[PDB]
Amino acid sequence: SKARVYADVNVLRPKEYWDYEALTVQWGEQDDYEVVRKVGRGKYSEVFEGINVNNNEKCIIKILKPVKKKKIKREIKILQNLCGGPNIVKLLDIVRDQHSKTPSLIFEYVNNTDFKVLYPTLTDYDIRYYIYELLKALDYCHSQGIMHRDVKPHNVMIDHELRKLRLIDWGLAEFYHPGKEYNVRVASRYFKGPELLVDLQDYDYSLDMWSLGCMFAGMIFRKEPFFYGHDNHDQLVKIAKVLGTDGLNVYLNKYRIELDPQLEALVGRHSRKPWLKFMNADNQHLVSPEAIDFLDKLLRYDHQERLTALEAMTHPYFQQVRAAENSR
Numbered sequence: 147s148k149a150r151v152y153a154d155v156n157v158l159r160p161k162e163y164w165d166y167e168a169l170t171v172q173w174g175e176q177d178d179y180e181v182v183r184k185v186g187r188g189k190y191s192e193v194f195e196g197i198n199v200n201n202n203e204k205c206i207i208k209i210l211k212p213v214k215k216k217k218i219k220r221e222i223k224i225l226q227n228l229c230g231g232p233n234i235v236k237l238l239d240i241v242r243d244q245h246s247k248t249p250s251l252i253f254e255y256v257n258n259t260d261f262k263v264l265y266p267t268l269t270d271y272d273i274r275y276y277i278y279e280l281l282k283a284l285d286y287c288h289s290q291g292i293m294h295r296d297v298k299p300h301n302v303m304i305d306h307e308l309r310k311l312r313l314i315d316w317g318l319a320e321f322y323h324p325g326k327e328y329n330v331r332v333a334s335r336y337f338k339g340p341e342l343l344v345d346l347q348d349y350d351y352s353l354d355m356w357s358l359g360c361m362f363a364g365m366i367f368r369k370e371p372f373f374y375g376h377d378n379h380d381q382l383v384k385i386a387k388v389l390g391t392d393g394l395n396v397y398l399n400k401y402r403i404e405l406d407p408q409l410e411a412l413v414g415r416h417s418r419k420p421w422l423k424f425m426n427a428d429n430q431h432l433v434s435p436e437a438i439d440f441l442d443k444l445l446r447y448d449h450q451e452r453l454t455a456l457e458a459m460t461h462p463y464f465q466q467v468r469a470a471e472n473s474r
């Protein structure tokens with residue numbers, strides 16, 4: 147399998163661009179930055195609002211937990227390459243603690259509104275707008291030969307007052323190389339594409355489009371998360387129960403993939419369900435025909451069938467967002 151767009155970005159670019167293991171970090175001054183308060187945390191980092199004591203400007207301080215040095219150079223390189231792109235969080239400095247060697251990545255300040263509280267209040271138009279803005283981030287990183295691999299609401303920071311969006315946490319992102327076999331243990335379970343769940347390792351940018359589709363579905367149907375499985379096997383079951391197993395067999399046959407006799411027994415047999423089966427009073431309107439057409443074009447087993455980020459941006463679902471942007 148290979149990506150249908152941007153397959154050659156790293157083929158044409160100098161090894162300097164994608165050879166992150168060869169990166170040698172230039173450490174800044176750790177004293178330039180003071181923690182103000184913790185604002186987030188995860189398996190790989192703790193995140194704080196900080197202050198740059200030189201200019202007294204706010205910033206974000208991401209303190210990295212112990213991991214392989216290669217993963218640290220990878221995130222740094224990718225952030226450097228993407229810095230300046232639309233709606234990509236900006237890495238401004240990198241520092242570390244002399245004694246412990248604990249590294250911290252310093253980012254432009256981002257003022258997040260918690261998605262669990264934000265999403266319920268989003269209007270129809272807000273959803274179209276924020277998804278369009280996210281799509282800019284994704285087409286951009288894809289055009290620069292990079293897959294995010296962890297698209298989920300937690301990694302989409304939104305300052306709703308200023309209608310600003312930033313795609314964050316590039317700690318799982320990777321460079322795309324045609325034919326390369328990647329680790330499938332990426333992305334949060336609810337947002338794992340079928341390719342990850344059936345061990346198709348030569349995947350690409352289209353992985354991010356499945357994860358986006360999951361986010362979108364959760365938004366318009368007001369179900370968080372949309373595909374709610376308890377482990378990876380169960381996650382594939384939840385997908386099969388909606389998309390149907392006929393399509394799954396076609397997918398697996400196309401890519402010559404064999405399912406575990408165990409996993410296969412679990413998945414069983416399911417008809418494809420219509421997207422409107424999930425419409426209800428809390429969500430009936432968020433679920434217009436254009437929303438369903440667009441969603442349906444993202445949530446496809448076959449990664450090669452999914453809309454690209456660029457295509458997605460042009461779907462008529464977003465026509466008003468485009469019109470409003472053009473008039474500016």
Ligand SMILES: Cc1cc(O)c2c(c1)C(=O)c1cc(O)cc(O)c1C2=O
Nearest residue numbers: 185186193206253256258314315316
């Ligand atoms: C709860 C929370 C609030 C944030 O503002 C950030 C994060 C989490 C966060 O995880 C994060 C990761 C990152 O790689 C860059 C960031 O700017 C961030 C963040 O800015």
Ligand SMILES: [Cl-]
Nearest residue numbers: 226237238239
């Ligand atoms: Cl930098």
